[PDB]
Symmetry: D3
Subunit: 161 residues, 6 copies
């Protein structure tokens, strides 16, 4: 079977990232900068997921929404038109989700245990780049590169200075 | 004759765009990122318009303001100095206006019926790119490409799936 | 001797810039976009300064923090890993400081009279580019190019129009 | 009336530039990097000019060639498809022409006295950027900025050192 | 089983592209600009392919060559070091091959019928961008966008002008 | 005392690089792409060096040549005009030299033992990026990152696979 979720599904560095968060927070706008930044859009506002394996989930946009993105202030926008074929992608695996929230103090998952992170929304923060970094990073670990390793490496430096 | 208006007049993709909005909203700052992004500045803070035809209006900066842009925090700035000749332009036609506002719920015009749009200002929104998109888009339509057409095209897809 | 300060120390255009401001304002996030924008990180959150001359001060990161940057939402991040060698620098001279504040109305200095500027934090303002401009500008003056000169030059224009 | 010419007509910085030169030299390929670099394509391989004034000439592509560009190795290419609306433009004024030649030693014009320059083709030369510079420059002069002026300015420096 | 081939295997837009061509032609250098341009390197100079399905082939670098790239003039280079994690990728599917040749006049395939194209090497041609375009294009077709369709569309224009 | 040399002196990543090579090879053109790429020009065609220490040499342009660059096809060019203050720099230390040559088969130094490398000039090679890499690399080593280390690291992989 399949299901539907809110949020926009972009493709960053070939990494399926599903941006989620209470309406108005800035998911469509952020996905627009990401697309403008060379990344691929799959689904905006509403996403149709269809689990492929027991560890791999796929998402896509409902037929009507294809190649489209709404943005409070300009309304519906065809990214294919404005940016060319490299701004859209039919389907993709959701390898990570980013929940855009707001403010408080501070390795989650979701609907079929999928890597998830939550970033706060506040003045002076480019969500587009933070999501770009979030992806680069997630990808970096998969290869073994971790902040912890570098951190353990720095610690030696002192001990053995 | 001629007249003067508040707001900054940038040139995006050869498209005269006049950014307007209550002081402090971020018109000069936004025009600074647009310039840094390769677009041309014509007039900042105050613009002198002089209707050419009955359908074409032109705008320019008062002599003193030439090549200058003020920014709360750094004061007056000469864009010619910091970015070179490609960051400034003497005059230009105002083909579109963008009114930067704030928040509520939701094809206007103005002083000689000129295409106009209003975008809300709120955390997580790169006004510079939204204005860049606004221009690309306005330009796209003039060529026939519309979200509606793509939308009607998607609708068929289902009907004739 | 030496001392320690809060704030992040980036290197922009070979210009040592120390970003300061009440926690949460967005110094680490902003330094992350600057790094992503090709600039070099020296120290994040905490900086260790060691005056070289009576006019030249140097700053560096405590051994553990080396190559690292924390960001509310992704935690500790190794910029060397994500961006390569050109995103980090061991030490550097602090030629300018930028204090990120908020709101009110409106050529300072500090601990060994060092050029300083204060920029307000508010929606619709890319601190990363403003700091980039701040640096370009500071650098421009050192070469004689000033807004004042251009301003005096524009004034003639009228007088001798 | 109208006429037709060989060469590709790109739009750089809103400046109509008609690239010409013996087949195989690299006009289509170069116009492809320029388009990829954010500039607008008007006509490739063959251009249809139609003088507007006695000082202003306009050029456009024959209907079939619209939005297309051939490239030895990939054949016909639709730039609208690959790059979006901002990669094409219907018509434009030819303000400058650049003749791509080869080698020898060293302010021309043409068919209705139009500013013209000739650049040599040889290993280690990015024609795309040289044409970009050629345009920026042509534009810079129109505003008064000239190498000669800067040169006369440098000369004083010594005399009055 | 598996096999080995000459040429470099880059990842462009998530598209496995295997650049081939007589030594000295410029495969490593070109892959270096592509990496510098944000694309991922998998294997340089020598590639180890291992067919996954009967329609899908995979390629990777021999253990020693990992993260490395030789360039006549600088010798061996670690792209991970210079550009960060986003410049390398362990393995990938070879969806297309580009054979860099030279000169003569003018839909091939190879070892398990894989889409292939041949581009000529000659002054005034940025192989990096042509390969970038080659990929965008190959990808564009898979989605239905073709030069032929646009061409048939232009033809109507006249017939029904 | 002081002396003069041929070649152009650019500043890449704050690294003084002196490009040398038989006239016509493409030093000025290459330095033009580097400047366009955000790097700083110090001296073109002719450089005036003045040894500071016994290990540190400085170079600058003769007063007349200041801010200027000649390019076969456009003649003298003022980079300050076309690109802004960030395209020029008064003086700088020459930390590396790159000799642009041509073709044959294959850790030098010079006039006060200065790190030197020689790169071949041939179709399909972006000298601008190779020089950019050359600098990043030289800089990377100074920090300990070497291809050899990564190479020794890869070798273990097999031995201890």
């Amino acid at each position: 079977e399949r299901r539907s979720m809110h949020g926009v599904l972009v493709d960053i560095y070939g990494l399926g990232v599903l941006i989620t968060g209470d309406s108005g927070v800035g998911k469509s706008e952020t996905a627009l900068e990401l697309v403008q930044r060379g990344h691929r859009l799959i689904a905006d506002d509403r996403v149709d997921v269809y689990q492929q394996d027991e560890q791999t989930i796929v998402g896509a946009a409902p037929p009507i929404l294809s190649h489209l993105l709404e943005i409070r202030g300009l309304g519906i926008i065809d990214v294919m038109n404005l940016f060319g074929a490299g701004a859209v992608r039919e389907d993709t695996t959701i390898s990570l989700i980013v929940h855009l929230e707001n403010w408080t103090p501070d390795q989650l998952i979701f609907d079929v245990p999928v890597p998830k992170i939550t970033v706060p929304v506040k003045v002076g923060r480019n969500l587009a780049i933070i999501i770009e970094v979030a992806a680069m990073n997630f990808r970096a670990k998969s290869m073994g590169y971790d902040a912890t390793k570098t951190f353990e490496k720095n610690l030696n430096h002192l001990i053995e200075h």
